[PDB]
């Protein structure tokens, strides 16, 4: 169907972090290169999203709001997939030039968060997720977190998000457990993103003390948008309760 054609056509390719793998693993080096991975993946997320079916239906500020709220889950989900398809979930495949082994999961001071992501990635295997189910699930994560007070044009958002749910059910089809399972997986992204939000926020606050570099858009998002989530003004949309 046309819908899948589009998701496959617009899917972003390979994004390198620019990490200097000659330097020793340090918290500051590992964290700075991850921050730079984020800024570069943010650009691709933007161009991907604008090309999504119906997305231009949203008020422009909603378009931007939804991107600035959901990029963490989006990116974590896609990295989980990469990890699964590249290294069979043994390591976290942030980028071809930034692969976390256990030592790096430790050196990043994010080890428990990393364990959760590896667990996510393991799920793609355990559940035999297909490329198409991946692609549709990922699209939905863009419409998975909104302000508690609603969006500028809430109706267009609701209808878009409904359609993306419909598409995921479609490319699924006792088939009942499947959907239970995929929604469940989708929900599980949310707590992980939440921890990373808490983590990146704390990190930015103190980053001058730890010589961690935050690029420009990352700095501003993390300080302007991310606290609206941490303070509870913006919350994920959970399938299950």
């Amino acid at each position: 169907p046309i819908f899948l054609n589009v998701l496959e056509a617009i899917e972003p390719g390979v994004v390198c972090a620019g990490h200097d793998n000659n330097q020793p693993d340090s918290f500051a080096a590992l964290l700075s290169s991850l921050n730079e991975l984020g800024e570069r993946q943010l650009v691709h997320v933007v161009k991907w999203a604008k090309a999504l079916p119906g997305f231009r239906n949203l008020h422009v500020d909603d378009q931007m709001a939804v991107i600035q709220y959901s990029w963490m889950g989006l990116m974590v989900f896609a990295m989980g997939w990469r990890s699964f398809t590249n290294v069979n979930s043994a390591m976290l495949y942030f980028a071809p030039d930034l692969v976390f082994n256990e030592y790096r999961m430790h050196k990043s001071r994010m080890y428990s968060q990393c364990v959760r992501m590896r667990h996510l990635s393991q799920e793609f295997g355990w559940l035999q997720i297909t490329p198409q189910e991946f692609l549709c699930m990922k699209a939905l994560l863009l419409f998975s977190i909104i302000p508690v007070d609603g969006l500028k044009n809430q109706k267009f958002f609701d209808e878009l998000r409904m359609n993306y749910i419909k598409e995921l059910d479609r490319i699924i089809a006792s088939c009942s457990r499947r959907f239970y399972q995929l929604t469940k997986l989708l929900d599980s992204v949310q707590p992980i993103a939440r921890e990373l939000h808490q983590f990146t926020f704390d990190l930015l606050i103190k980053s001058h003390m730890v010589s961690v570099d935050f690029p420009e858009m990352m700095a501003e998002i993390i300080s302007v948008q991310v606290p609206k989530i941490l303070s509870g003004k913006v919350k994920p949309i959970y399938f299950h309760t």
């Binding site: 933007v46 422009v60 378009q63 931007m64 501003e220 998002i221 302007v224």
Partner: peptide, 8 residues
């Protein structure tokens, strides 16, 4: 913002 300027 750096994001909105880039976006638009």
């Amino acid at each position: 913002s750096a994001f909105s300027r880039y976006y638009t």
